[PDB]
Amino acid sequence: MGSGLAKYLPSTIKLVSKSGTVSPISLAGKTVFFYFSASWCPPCRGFTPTLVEFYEKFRESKNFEVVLVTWDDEEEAYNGYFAKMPWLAIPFSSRAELEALRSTFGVETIPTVIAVNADTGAVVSTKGRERLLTDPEGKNFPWSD
Amino acid sequence: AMGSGLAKYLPSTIKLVSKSGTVSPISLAGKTVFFYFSASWCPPCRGFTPTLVEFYEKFRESKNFEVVLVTWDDEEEAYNGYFAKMPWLAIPFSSRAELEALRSTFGVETIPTVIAVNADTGAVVSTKGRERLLTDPEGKNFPWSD
């Protein structure tokens, strides 16, 4: 499946992990959080470790993945910031794909997490950046509505 | 020559677009320049734009300022239709790296935002005009510095 997630990206993209690459289709069956963030954004820098801790605890139990959608435009800054994260990222050089996601989800501000269902493409939630702060165990994950 | 404060923000090899033609960044010498980060797909942007248009029509001459759209649109027809509503200047749609560099330089986390700079010195003059214009339509406190 994962054909819902794949419709948000070119068919030829691979996501980057810490060690290799990941085909979007491999996220089938998961809730996928597009995390719009930048190393130069102070609230992003403070929110990232909150999301990292949640991912460490619940990635498998809640069956989700995070995909960084960078607003960094300098590759070394991107590299150092993504090094702090355990999840996936759109490659730094995929500038048009990054901008298409901003337009598609109407992302006016960072940090923002947009959750989609990888199989259907449906938007699952848009306020996780705020809701995670008062729900560290994710009892109300994925924070819909 | 004046206007050297803009050289880093608006490289001289890329002219700005106007309603009728093109404009070199150096032509903004001596002015306060508002970088207006905005997108046609952003509802608060669509509502703020006419407020800024009215202020520009009334006061851009008397207060010696210019507005430069920094687009977050990624579709050219959307950019064209939205900039058509505006009387000021814009970074060309295709200048994607220049647009992104301004976002990083001024740390623009949200739109709509206006960042004012001094065209001669490059100094940041104000960052909250998007909010402060709303309650100061005559610009009595322009350029709304902190």
Side-chain angles (χ1 to χ4, degrees):
Chain A
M1 303 214 200
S3 64
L5 174 63
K7 286 275 96 111
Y8 288 111
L9 313 170
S11 57
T12 56
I13 194 63
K14 291 267 273 284
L15 306 176
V16 296
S17 68
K18 210 182 283 293
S19 58
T21 54
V22 178
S23 288
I25 198 168
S26 297
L27 282 59
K30 295 184 180 192
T31 302
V32 178
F33 285 80
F34 287 113
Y35 178 32
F36 298 78
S37 193
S39 74
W40 46 257
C41 170
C44 286
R45 292 193 297 250
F47 178 70
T48 285
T50 306
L51 186 59
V52 169
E53 181 175 342
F54 187 76
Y55 186 93
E56 290 172 354
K57 289 180 174 182
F58 303 116
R59 173 196 76 74
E60 184 180 353
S61 65
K62 296 183 187 300
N63 197 38
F64 77 102
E65 188 54 271
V66 176
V67 178
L68 178 66
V69 185
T70 187
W71 287 14
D72 277 292
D73 77 327
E74 201 285 311
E75 190 161 8
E76 299 311 318
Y78 168 102
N79 286 342
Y81 185 47
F82 182 52
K84 300 179 182 182
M85 304 172 183
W87 49 64
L88 307 181
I90 292 171
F92 173 82
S93 67
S94 207
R95 309 312 296 183
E97 177 184 13
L98 296 164
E99 295 192 338
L101 290 167
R102 174 179 69 186
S103 286
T104 289
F105 297 116
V107 180
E108 303 166 6
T109 196
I110 54 169
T112 290
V113 287
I114 307 299
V116 301
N117 182 290
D119 296 340
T120 68
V123 176
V124 168
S125 67
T126 63
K127 300 300 188 195
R129 174 271 186 288
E130 300 153 14
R131 310 259 177 101
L132 173 58
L133 303 184
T134 56
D135 185 26
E137 308 306 313
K139 299 184 187 173
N140 289 309
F141 174 100
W143 307 296
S144 300
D145 312 334
Chain B
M2 304 305 297
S4 60
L6 295 180
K8 264 287 117 68
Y9 304 132
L10 298 170
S12 64
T13 49
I14 301 159
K15 303 187 76 180
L16 304 178
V17 179
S18 70
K19 203 157 282 281
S20 56
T22 57
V23 171
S24 292
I26 191 169
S27 75
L28 285 57
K31 298 192 170 176
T32 303
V33 174
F34 286 81
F35 290 112
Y36 179 31
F37 297 79
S38 194
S40 75
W41 46 256
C42 169
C45 286
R46 291 190 307 254
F48 178 69
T49 285
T51 303
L52 186 58
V53 169
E54 183 169 3
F55 184 77
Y56 185 91
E57 289 167 351
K58 292 183 168 193
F59 301 116
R60 71 103 178 170
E61 291 190 306
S62 65
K63 294 190 181 294
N64 200 228
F65 72 92
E66 186 56 273
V67 173
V68 176
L69 176 69
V70 187
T71 187
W72 288 13
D73 276 292
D74 76 327
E75 202 284 307
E76 193 165 7
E77 297 309 319
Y79 167 99
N80 286 341
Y82 184 47
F83 180 53
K85 303 180 181 180
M86 302 172 183
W88 48 65
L89 306 178
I91 294 168
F93 175 81
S94 64
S95 201
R96 310 313 293 184
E98 181 181 13
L99 298 165
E100 293 202 289
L102 290 168
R103 176 180 66 185
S104 283
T105 289
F106 298 116
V108 180
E109 302 164 6
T110 192
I111 54 168
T113 289
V114 287
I115 306 298
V117 305
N118 183 306
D120 293 339
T121 68
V124 176
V125 170
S126 68
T127 66
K128 301 303 183 197
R130 176 270 186 287
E131 285 93 0
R132 307 224 177 126
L133 172 57
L134 305 184
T135 58
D136 186 26
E138 301 298 304
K140 306 184 192 172
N141 292 316
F142 172 101
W144 308 295
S145 303
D146 287 308

